[PDB]
Amino acid sequence: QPLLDAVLANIRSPVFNHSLYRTFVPAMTAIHGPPITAPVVCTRKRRLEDDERQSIPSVLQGEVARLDPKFLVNLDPSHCSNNGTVHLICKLDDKDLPSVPPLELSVPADYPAQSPLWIDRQWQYDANPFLQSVHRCMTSRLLQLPDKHSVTALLNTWAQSVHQACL
Amino acid sequence: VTCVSQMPVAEGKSVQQTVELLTRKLEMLGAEKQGTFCVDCETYHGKLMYVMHYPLSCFALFENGPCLIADTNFDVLMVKLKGFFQSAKASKIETRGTRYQYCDFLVKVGTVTMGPSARGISVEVEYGDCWSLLLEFLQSFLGSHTPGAPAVFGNAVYGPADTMVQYMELFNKI
Amino acid sequence: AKHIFLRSRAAATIDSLASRIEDPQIQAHWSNINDVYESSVKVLITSQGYEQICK
Amino acid sequence: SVNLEAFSQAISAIQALRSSVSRVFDCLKDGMRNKETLEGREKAFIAHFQDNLHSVNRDLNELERLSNLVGKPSENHPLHNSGLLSLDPYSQLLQAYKWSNKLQYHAGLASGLLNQQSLKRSANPQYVDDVISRIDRMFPEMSIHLSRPNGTSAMLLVTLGKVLKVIVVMRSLFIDRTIVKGYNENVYTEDGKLDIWSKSNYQVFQKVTDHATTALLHYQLPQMPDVVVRSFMTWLRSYIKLFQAPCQRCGKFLQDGLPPTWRDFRTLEA
């Protein structure tokens, strides 16, 4: 119902909106007498400096640090200093036969990253038929994973296939 | 208790074929053969005779269900009135059929007696009104049917042989 | 049948305690009114040295 | 006389209206702090406008309610307080009233929240039964009776709107060994020769019997048998309708009911 004041205040859209002071602040000072508006020590400092400058993205290491002790993570020659930020080598230590370690080179946190690429796929996997079939089963299992995550999903499926390898 | 029966609303094919389809639907729902009974019908000009579950009969033109007598106990009295109330007109049509029971329930369909007769169905419950709960059974069983129309705002009550009014109404509709 | 069955049940229950002692024992409680055919037995876990484990 | 809640609601409503109009007028003292993109302050303005509409609507809705107060206020009860200062030392009465109410509320809340106890363990009369039966029988629409023909043990039954009576024969204090029936199907008045048990039904109320047995093994408090039987009878009373069936439709099975938490729902699902 009270629409005249609304549209009338909306008319004064351009930059010259200052008389509102003389129209309202006398009445406000009359009814309200608050000395406490912003007397406390305060200053606006939005940003000074924000960057890692010390390590890899925190989310990845923080998440992989809580994985099982069955795995072991370390670093290769540093060919992923800034962008990749991870070049990991994992060796499954459990009640099963081990295998060739993965590459584990990830991308930004969107994670469309099939991090291992099997650089030594051909010979190291044609060495024996058993591990060759193991690799084949792994690859067949990987494609069904929608938007897999190298951090958890990839390694988990790899361990699952390696433990199912005994048929 | 004794829920009111329902007229055979579904009538689009052969009565025998209709009974067959009803039995097939009952079997698809899942039930067991709870035996077979009969529903007699003999009017006297009014009192429609009948017998069902067990050794007891009813016949009443318009009364507050005076039944506590068996078949013989009433037949002897009827025969005794060979000139007082002997109004044995043309034999009224009477249906029969088997009975099934899914769970805590019972179903019973009727058939034609002379051939141009109805194929009505009868269902009851185990509670004392519960008219809402029993409905969903037929709603899942068949399409739009089972009007019910019980004697509401009375507590006749519990529907003791009260279905005879609708039975005689369907019998007159010929 | 009821008699021999109740006897076998009681025997099994009392032997359960002997067969497992270090394990949480079992308390036995029978009804005070047992019908001819009907009867009831109350049995609780009754974890040792505790009363707040009646779950 | 529960209009106090609506009146407190109206109090809160008018306080919020005053606060809102004050804040609206204070915010109009200055424009956009630092927009730099547009004049989107119109959004907040319209929000405050709608808040004013909300306030007006609430005021109207509360005016519609709260019809009127009764004549002769205070109902002549504090006339002593209304009396002269000769007899009034009178405010002490209201003080004690408020103190008692506050203490009662505090004790209730404390007892309620203290339900999660920390007692790791609990270690170092044919007159209470009749009293408990008399106390429970004062409740309406739920008639009880007892004959006890077996002996020292208690034998009793309860009735409801229908004839679905329940036979509960238990010990002196706590309820156990119960059974259910429906519509005189038990006839436990002089069944055969006397008030027989027969531990049976026509294969429909077996589920209800199992539920009641489970409840008996659930409401078994360590002490306070009165509270135990009260909870028992409240649990029993929850079947007076047997019509609704949440978390499902009322066609899932023979019936639907299992309210151990004072709320019924479709059975065979917990």
Side-chain angles (χ1 to χ4, degrees), chain D residues 6-7 10-16 20-21 24-25 31 34 40-41:
Chain D
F7 281 129
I11 290 279
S12 46
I14 183 57
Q15 291 318 289
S20 46
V21 300
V24 160
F25 270 33
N34 204 334
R41 58 95 175 173

PDB file of all heavy atoms in Angstrom, chain D residues 3-43, unseen atoms left out:
ATOM      1  N   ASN D   3      -4.722 -18.103  25.921  1.00  0.00           N
ATOM      2  CA  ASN D   3      -4.525 -16.916  25.097  1.00  0.00           C
ATOM      3  C   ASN D   3      -3.218 -16.202  25.413  1.00  0.00           C
ATOM      4  O   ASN D   3      -2.811 -15.312  24.656  1.00  0.00           O
ATOM      5  CB  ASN D   3      -5.700 -15.953  25.276  1.00  0.00           C
ATOM      6  N   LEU D   4      -2.559 -16.564  26.516  1.00  0.00           N
ATOM      7  CA  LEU D   4      -1.288 -15.954  26.886  1.00  0.00           C
ATOM      8  C   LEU D   4      -0.245 -16.131  25.790  1.00  0.00           C
ATOM      9  O   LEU D   4       0.568 -15.236  25.534  1.00  0.00           O
ATOM     10  CB  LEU D   4      -0.792 -16.551  28.207  1.00  0.00           C
ATOM     11  N   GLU D   5      -0.262 -17.289  25.125  1.00  0.00           N
ATOM     12  CA  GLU D   5       0.677 -17.531  24.035  1.00  0.00           C
ATOM     13  C   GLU D   5       0.436 -16.575  22.875  1.00  0.00           C
ATOM     14  O   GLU D   5       1.379 -15.981  22.341  1.00  0.00           O
ATOM     15  CB  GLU D   5       0.572 -18.983  23.566  1.00  0.00           C
ATOM     16  N   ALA D   6      -0.826 -16.406  22.476  1.00  0.00           N
ATOM     17  CA  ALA D   6      -1.148 -15.494  21.385  1.00  0.00           C
ATOM     18  C   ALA D   6      -0.816 -14.055  21.761  1.00  0.00           C
ATOM     19  O   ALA D   6      -0.382 -13.259  20.921  1.00  0.00           O
ATOM     20  CB  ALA D   6      -2.624 -15.631  21.007  1.00  0.00           C
ATOM     21  N   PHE D   7      -1.000 -13.705  23.035  1.00  0.00           N
ATOM     22  CA  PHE D   7      -0.706 -12.344  23.465  1.00  0.00           C
ATOM     23  C   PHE D   7       0.797 -12.082  23.488  1.00  0.00           C
ATOM     24  O   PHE D   7       1.253 -10.998  23.107  1.00  0.00           O
ATOM     25  CB  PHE D   7      -1.335 -12.089  24.833  1.00  0.00           C
ATOM     26  CG  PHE D   7      -2.807 -11.804  24.768  1.00  0.00           C
ATOM     27  CD1 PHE D   7      -3.696 -12.490  25.574  1.00  0.00           C
ATOM     28  CD2 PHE D   7      -3.305 -10.869  23.875  1.00  0.00           C
ATOM     29  CE1 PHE D   7      -5.054 -12.235  25.508  1.00  0.00           C
ATOM     30  CE2 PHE D   7      -4.659 -10.607  23.805  1.00  0.00           C
ATOM     31  CZ  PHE D   7      -5.536 -11.293  24.622  1.00  0.00           C
ATOM     32  N   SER D   8       1.584 -13.070  23.918  1.00  0.00           N
ATOM     33  CA  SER D   8       3.035 -12.955  23.833  1.00  0.00           C
ATOM     34  C   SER D   8       3.481 -12.864  22.378  1.00  0.00           C
ATOM     35  O   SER D   8       4.428 -12.143  22.041  1.00  0.00           O
ATOM     36  CB  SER D   8       3.696 -14.144  24.533  1.00  0.00           C
ATOM     37  N   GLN D   9       2.796 -13.597  21.498  1.00  0.00           N
ATOM     38  CA  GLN D   9       3.085 -13.503  20.071  1.00  0.00           C
ATOM     39  C   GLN D   9       2.811 -12.099  19.549  1.00  0.00           C
ATOM     40  O   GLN D   9       3.587 -11.559  18.758  1.00  0.00           O
ATOM     41  CB  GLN D   9       2.262 -14.535  19.299  1.00  0.00           C
ATOM     42  N   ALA D  10       1.713 -11.488  19.997  1.00  0.00           N
ATOM     43  CA  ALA D  10       1.392 -10.126  19.577  1.00  0.00           C
ATOM     44  C   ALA D  10       2.409  -9.127  20.120  1.00  0.00           C
ATOM     45  O   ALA D  10       2.761  -8.148  19.451  1.00  0.00           O
ATOM     46  CB  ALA D  10      -0.021  -9.758  20.030  1.00  0.00           C
ATOM     47  N   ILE D  11       2.882  -9.357  21.345  1.00  0.00           N
ATOM     48  CA  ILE D  11       3.930  -8.539  21.946  1.00  0.00           C
ATOM     49  C   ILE D  11       5.178  -8.595  21.074  1.00  0.00           C
ATOM     50  O   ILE D  11       5.750  -7.559  20.711  1.00  0.00           O
ATOM     51  CB  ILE D  11       4.243  -8.999  23.381  1.00  0.00           C
ATOM     52  CG1 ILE D  11       3.083  -8.662  24.321  1.00  0.00           C
ATOM     53  CG2 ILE D  11       5.544  -8.380  23.871  1.00  0.00           C
ATOM     54  CD1 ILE D  11       3.081  -7.225  24.797  1.00  0.00           C
ATOM     55  N   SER D  12       5.615  -9.813  20.749  1.00  0.00           N
ATOM     56  CA  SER D  12       6.781  -9.981  19.890  1.00  0.00           C
ATOM     57  C   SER D  12       6.554  -9.333  18.531  1.00  0.00           C
ATOM     58  O   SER D  12       7.471  -8.748  17.948  1.00  0.00           O
ATOM     59  CB  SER D  12       7.106 -11.467  19.731  1.00  0.00           C
ATOM     60  OG  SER D  12       5.936 -12.216  19.465  1.00  0.00           O
ATOM     61  N   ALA D  13       5.323  -9.411  18.024  1.00  0.00           N
ATOM     62  CA  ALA D  13       5.012  -8.855  16.712  1.00  0.00           C
ATOM     63  C   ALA D  13       5.148  -7.337  16.711  1.00  0.00           C
ATOM     64  O   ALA D  13       5.760  -6.758  15.808  1.00  0.00           O
ATOM     65  CB  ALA D  13       3.602  -9.273  16.291  1.00  0.00           C
ATOM     66  N   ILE D  14       4.580  -6.672  17.720  1.00  0.00           N
ATOM     67  CA  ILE D  14       4.677  -5.217  17.769  1.00  0.00           C
ATOM     68  C   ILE D  14       6.105  -4.769  18.054  1.00  0.00           C
ATOM     69  O   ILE D  14       6.558  -3.755  17.505  1.00  0.00           O
ATOM     70  CB  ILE D  14       3.678  -4.628  18.793  1.00  0.00           C
ATOM     71  CG1 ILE D  14       3.744  -3.100  18.788  1.00  0.00           C
ATOM     72  CG2 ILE D  14       3.928  -5.162  20.188  1.00  0.00           C
ATOM     73  CD1 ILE D  14       3.480  -2.481  17.434  1.00  0.00           C
ATOM     74  N   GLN D  15       6.846  -5.519  18.876  1.00  0.00           N
ATOM     75  CA  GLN D  15       8.249  -5.192  19.101  1.00  0.00           C
ATOM     76  C   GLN D  15       9.047  -5.302  17.807  1.00  0.00           C
ATOM     77  O   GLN D  15       9.868  -4.434  17.485  1.00  0.00           O
ATOM     78  CB  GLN D  15       8.833  -6.105  20.181  1.00  0.00           C
ATOM     79  CG  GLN D  15       8.286  -5.845  21.572  1.00  0.00           C
ATOM     80  CD  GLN D  15       8.171  -4.366  21.881  1.00  0.00           C
ATOM     81  OE1 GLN D  15       9.177  -3.679  22.062  1.00  0.00           O
ATOM     82  NE2 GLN D  15       6.942  -3.868  21.943  1.00  0.00           N
ATOM     83  N   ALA D  16       8.804  -6.370  17.043  1.00  0.00           N
ATOM     84  CA  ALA D  16       9.492  -6.550  15.772  1.00  0.00           C
ATOM     85  C   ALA D  16       9.098  -5.471  14.777  1.00  0.00           C
ATOM     86  O   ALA D  16       9.927  -5.016  13.986  1.00  0.00           O
ATOM     87  CB  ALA D  16       9.196  -7.939  15.206  1.00  0.00           C
ATOM     88  N   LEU D  17       7.833  -5.046  14.801  1.00  0.00           N
ATOM     89  CA  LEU D  17       7.393  -3.974  13.914  1.00  0.00           C
ATOM     90  C   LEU D  17       8.124  -2.676  14.228  1.00  0.00           C
ATOM     91  O   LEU D  17       8.620  -1.990  13.324  1.00  0.00           O
ATOM     92  CB  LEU D  17       5.880  -3.785  14.032  1.00  0.00           C
ATOM     93  N   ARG D  18       8.196  -2.325  15.514  1.00  0.00           N
ATOM     94  CA  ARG D  18       8.926  -1.126  15.914  1.00  0.00           C
ATOM     95  C   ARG D  18      10.392  -1.217  15.507  1.00  0.00           C
ATOM     96  O   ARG D  18      10.951  -0.272  14.934  1.00  0.00           O
ATOM     97  CB  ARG D  18       8.797  -0.915  17.424  1.00  0.00           C
ATOM     98  N   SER D  19      11.028  -2.354  15.786  1.00  0.00           N
ATOM     99  CA  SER D  19      12.435  -2.545  15.454  1.00  0.00           C
ATOM    100  C   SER D  19      12.664  -2.435  13.952  1.00  0.00           C
ATOM    101  O   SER D  19      13.629  -1.804  13.510  1.00  0.00           O
ATOM    102  CB  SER D  19      12.925  -3.900  15.967  1.00  0.00           C
ATOM    103  N   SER D  20      11.774  -3.033  13.162  1.00  0.00           N
ATOM    104  CA  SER D  20      11.907  -3.044  11.714  1.00  0.00           C
ATOM    105  C   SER D  20      11.750  -1.646  11.139  1.00  0.00           C
ATOM    106  O   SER D  20      12.539  -1.243  10.281  1.00  0.00           O
ATOM    107  CB  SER D  20      10.881  -3.991  11.087  1.00  0.00           C
ATOM    108  OG  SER D  20       9.599  -3.794  11.653  1.00  0.00           O
ATOM    109  N   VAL D  21      10.740  -0.898  11.591  1.00  0.00           N
ATOM    110  CA  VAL D  21      10.569   0.450  11.054  1.00  0.00           C
ATOM    111  C   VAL D  21      11.727   1.344  11.477  1.00  0.00           C
ATOM    112  O   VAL D  21      12.194   2.181  10.691  1.00  0.00           O
ATOM    113  CB  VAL D  21       9.200   1.043  11.457  1.00  0.00           C
ATOM    114  CG1 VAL D  21       8.072   0.173  10.924  1.00  0.00           C
ATOM    115  CG2 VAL D  21       9.084   1.211  12.961  1.00  0.00           C
ATOM    116  N   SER D  22      12.240   1.162  12.699  1.00  0.00           N
ATOM    117  CA  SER D  22      13.400   1.936  13.130  1.00  0.00           C
ATOM    118  C   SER D  22      14.616   1.622  12.268  1.00  0.00           C
ATOM    119  O   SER D  22      15.337   2.529  11.836  1.00  0.00           O
ATOM    120  CB  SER D  22      13.694   1.659  14.605  1.00  0.00           C
ATOM    121  N   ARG D  23      14.855   0.337  11.997  1.00  0.00           N
ATOM    122  CA  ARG D  23      16.001  -0.051  11.182  1.00  0.00           C
ATOM    123  C   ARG D  23      15.851   0.433   9.746  1.00  0.00           C
ATOM    124  O   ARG D  23      16.835   0.818   9.105  1.00  0.00           O
ATOM    125  CB  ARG D  23      16.180  -1.569  11.219  1.00  0.00           C
ATOM    126  N   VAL D  24      14.626   0.419   9.224  1.00  0.00           N
ATOM    127  CA  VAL D  24      14.350   0.882   7.869  1.00  0.00           C
ATOM    128  C   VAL D  24      14.669   2.365   7.781  1.00  0.00           C
ATOM    129  O   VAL D  24      15.328   2.817   6.837  1.00  0.00           O
ATOM    130  CB  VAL D  24      12.889   0.604   7.473  1.00  0.00           C
ATOM    131  CG1 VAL D  24      12.471   1.494   6.311  1.00  0.00           C
ATOM    132  CG2 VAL D  24      12.707  -0.860   7.120  1.00  0.00           C
ATOM    133  N   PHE D  25      14.210   3.133   8.770  1.00  0.00           N
ATOM    134  CA  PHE D  25      14.457   4.571   8.752  1.00  0.00           C
ATOM    135  C   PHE D  25      15.937   4.879   8.943  1.00  0.00           C
ATOM    136  O   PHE D  25      16.460   5.840   8.368  1.00  0.00           O
ATOM    137  CB  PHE D  25      13.611   5.257   9.821  1.00  0.00           C
ATOM    138  CG  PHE D  25      12.264   5.686   9.330  1.00  0.00           C
ATOM    139  CD1 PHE D  25      11.600   4.944   8.367  1.00  0.00           C
ATOM    140  CD2 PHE D  25      11.661   6.828   9.821  1.00  0.00           C
ATOM    141  CE1 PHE D  25      10.361   5.331   7.907  1.00  0.00           C
ATOM    142  CE2 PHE D  25      10.421   7.220   9.365  1.00  0.00           C
ATOM    143  CZ  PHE D  25       9.771   6.471   8.405  1.00  0.00           C
ATOM    144  N   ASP D  26      16.632   4.070   9.746  1.00  0.00           N
ATOM    145  CA  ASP D  26      18.060   4.286   9.950  1.00  0.00           C
ATOM    146  C   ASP D  26      18.862   3.960   8.697  1.00  0.00           C
ATOM    147  O   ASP D  26      19.838   4.653   8.385  1.00  0.00           O
ATOM    148  CB  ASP D  26      18.555   3.446  11.128  1.00  0.00           C
ATOM    149  N   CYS D  27      18.470   2.913   7.968  1.00  0.00           N
ATOM    150  CA  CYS D  27      19.189   2.540   6.756  1.00  0.00           C
ATOM    151  C   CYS D  27      18.999   3.555   5.638  1.00  0.00           C
ATOM    152  O   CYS D  27      19.858   3.659   4.757  1.00  0.00           O
ATOM    153  CB  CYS D  27      18.743   1.155   6.285  1.00  0.00           C
ATOM    154  N   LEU D  28      17.897   4.307   5.654  1.00  0.00           N
ATOM    155  CA  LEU D  28      17.664   5.320   4.634  1.00  0.00           C
ATOM    156  C   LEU D  28      18.502   6.572   4.852  1.00  0.00           C
ATOM    157  O   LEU D  28      18.460   7.482   4.016  1.00  0.00           O
ATOM    158  CB  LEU D  28      16.182   5.694   4.592  1.00  0.00           C
ATOM    159  N   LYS D  29      19.254   6.642   5.949  1.00  0.00           N
ATOM    160  CA  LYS D  29      20.096   7.798   6.230  1.00  0.00           C
ATOM    161  C   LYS D  29      21.290   7.847   5.284  1.00  0.00           C
ATOM    162  O   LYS D  29      21.885   8.910   5.082  1.00  0.00           O
ATOM    163  CB  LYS D  29      20.572   7.773   7.684  1.00  0.00           C
ATOM    164  N   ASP D  30      21.649   6.704   4.702  1.00  0.00           N
ATOM    165  CA  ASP D  30      22.775   6.637   3.783  1.00  0.00           C
ATOM    166  C   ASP D  30      22.410   5.739   2.611  1.00  0.00           C
ATOM    167  O   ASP D  30      21.557   4.854   2.723  1.00  0.00           O
ATOM    168  CB  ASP D  30      24.041   6.125   4.479  1.00  0.00           C
ATOM    169  N   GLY D  31      23.070   5.976   1.483  1.00  0.00           N
ATOM    170  CA  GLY D  31      22.830   5.189   0.289  1.00  0.00           C
ATOM    171  C   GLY D  31      23.692   3.947   0.224  1.00  0.00           C
ATOM    172  O   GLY D  31      24.073   3.396   1.262  1.00  0.00           O
ATOM    173  N   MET D  32      24.003   3.493  -0.989  1.00  0.00           N
ATOM    174  CA  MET D  32      24.862   2.329  -1.170  1.00  0.00           C
ATOM    175  C   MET D  32      26.261   2.613  -0.641  1.00  0.00           C
ATOM    176  O   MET D  32      26.862   3.636  -0.986  1.00  0.00           O
ATOM    177  CB  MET D  32      24.917   1.927  -2.644  1.00  0.00           C
ATOM    178  N   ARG D  33      26.785   1.718   0.198  1.00  0.00           N
ATOM    179  CA  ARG D  33      28.111   1.894   0.781  1.00  0.00           C
ATOM    180  C   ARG D  33      29.171   1.987  -0.308  1.00  0.00           C
ATOM    181  O   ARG D  33      29.822   3.025  -0.463  1.00  0.00           O
ATOM    182  CB  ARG D  33      28.431   0.746   1.741  1.00  0.00           C
ATOM    183  N   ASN D  34      29.349   0.906  -1.067  1.00  0.00           N
ATOM    184  CA  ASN D  34      30.222   0.929  -2.238  1.00  0.00           C
ATOM    185  C   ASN D  34      29.648  -0.066  -3.242  1.00  0.00           C
ATOM    186  O   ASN D  34      29.979  -1.254  -3.201  1.00  0.00           O
ATOM    187  CB  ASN D  34      31.658   0.586  -1.864  1.00  0.00           C
ATOM    188  CG  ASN D  34      32.665   1.135  -2.854  1.00  0.00           C
ATOM    189  OD1 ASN D  34      32.347   1.351  -4.023  1.00  0.00           O
ATOM    190  ND2 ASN D  34      33.887   1.364  -2.389  1.00  0.00           N
ATOM    191  N   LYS D  35      28.791   0.425  -4.135  1.00  0.00           N
ATOM    192  CA  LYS D  35      28.167  -0.432  -5.133  1.00  0.00           C
ATOM    193  C   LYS D  35      29.142  -0.741  -6.262  1.00  0.00           C
ATOM    194  O   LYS D  35      29.493  -1.904  -6.487  1.00  0.00           O
ATOM    195  CB  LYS D  35      26.903   0.227  -5.686  1.00  0.00           C
ATOM    196  N   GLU D  36      29.554   0.301  -6.989  1.00  0.00           N
ATOM    197  CA  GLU D  36      30.569   0.221  -8.035  1.00  0.00           C
ATOM    198  C   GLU D  36      30.103  -0.586  -9.242  1.00  0.00           C
ATOM    199  O   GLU D  36      30.835  -0.702 -10.229  1.00  0.00           O
ATOM    200  CB  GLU D  36      31.872  -0.366  -7.480  1.00  0.00           C
ATOM    201  N   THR D  37      28.898  -1.154  -9.182  1.00  0.00           N
ATOM    202  CA  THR D  37      28.393  -1.935 -10.303  1.00  0.00           C
ATOM    203  C   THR D  37      26.999  -1.490 -10.733  1.00  0.00           C
ATOM    204  O   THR D  37      26.699  -1.449 -11.929  1.00  0.00           O
ATOM    205  CB  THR D  37      28.374  -3.424  -9.949  1.00  0.00           C
ATOM    206  N   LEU D  38      26.148  -1.143  -9.766  1.00  0.00           N
ATOM    207  CA  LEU D  38      24.745  -0.866 -10.055  1.00  0.00           C
ATOM    208  C   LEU D  38      24.048  -0.221  -8.865  1.00  0.00           C
ATOM    209  O   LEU D  38      24.699   0.203  -7.906  1.00  0.00           O
ATOM    210  CB  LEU D  38      24.017  -2.152 -10.452  1.00  0.00           C
ATOM    211  N   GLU D  39      22.719  -0.140  -8.926  1.00  0.00           N
ATOM    212  CA  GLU D  39      21.923   0.415  -7.839  1.00  0.00           C
ATOM    213  C   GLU D  39      21.086  -0.681  -7.194  1.00  0.00           C
ATOM    214  O   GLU D  39      19.903  -0.481  -6.902  1.00  0.00           O
ATOM    215  CB  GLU D  39      21.028   1.547  -8.349  1.00  0.00           C
ATOM    216  N   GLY D  40      21.698  -1.848  -6.975  1.00  0.00           N
ATOM    217  CA  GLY D  40      20.954  -2.999  -6.486  1.00  0.00           C
ATOM    218  C   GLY D  40      20.408  -2.844  -5.080  1.00  0.00           C
ATOM    219  O   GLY D  40      19.801  -3.776  -4.544  1.00  0.00           O
ATOM    220  N   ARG D  41      20.612  -1.683  -4.458  1.00  0.00           N
ATOM    221  CA  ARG D  41      20.070  -1.421  -3.129  1.00  0.00           C
ATOM    222  C   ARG D  41      18.545  -1.441  -3.148  1.00  0.00           C
ATOM    223  O   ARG D  41      17.903  -1.570  -2.098  1.00  0.00           O
ATOM    224  CB  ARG D  41      20.587  -0.081  -2.596  1.00  0.00           C
ATOM    225  CG  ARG D  41      20.259   1.122  -3.470  1.00  0.00           C
ATOM    226  CD  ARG D  41      18.996   1.830  -3.003  1.00  0.00           C
ATOM    227  NE  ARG D  41      18.744   3.054  -3.758  1.00  0.00           N
ATOM    228  CZ  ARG D  41      17.645   3.791  -3.642  1.00  0.00           C
ATOM    229  NH1 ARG D  41      16.690   3.430  -2.795  1.00  0.00           N
ATOM    230  NH2 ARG D  41      17.499   4.889  -4.370  1.00  0.00           N
ATOM    231  N   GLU D  42      17.961  -1.298  -4.339  1.00  0.00           N
ATOM    232  CA  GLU D  42      16.518  -1.395  -4.511  1.00  0.00           C
ATOM    233  C   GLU D  42      16.014  -2.755  -4.047  1.00  0.00           C
ATOM    234  O   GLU D  42      14.880  -2.874  -3.577  1.00  0.00           O
ATOM    235  CB  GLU D  42      16.136  -1.154  -5.973  1.00  0.00           C
ATOM    236  N   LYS D  43      16.852  -3.785  -4.169  1.00  0.00           N
ATOM    237  CA  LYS D  43      16.503  -5.117  -3.691  1.00  0.00           C
ATOM    238  C   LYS D  43      16.283  -5.112  -2.183  1.00  0.00           C
ATOM    239  O   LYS D  43      15.250  -5.586  -1.699  1.00  0.00           O
ATOM    240  CB  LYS D  43      17.592  -6.124  -4.067  1.00  0.00           C
TER     241      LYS D  43
END
